[PDB]
């Protein structure tokens, strides 16, 4: 189950989706290992 204070958030206003650390302020699309490469 992924790290505390992170969520998925939309791209372009209307496109796809980024993945954001909310408590730090860090924008990416990619997983910090608490959910892995496949699971």
């Amino acid at each position: 189950k992924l790290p505390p204070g992170w969520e998925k958030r939309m791209s372009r206003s209307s496109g796809r989706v980024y993945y954001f650390n909310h408590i730090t302020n860090a924008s990416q699309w990619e997983r910090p290992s608490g959910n892995s490469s496949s699971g």
Partner: peptide
């Protein structure tokens, strides 16, 4: 870039 997916924001 301009149509923003934010991974490379410049």
């Amino acid at each position: 870039e301009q149509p923003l997916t934010p991974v490379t924001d410049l």
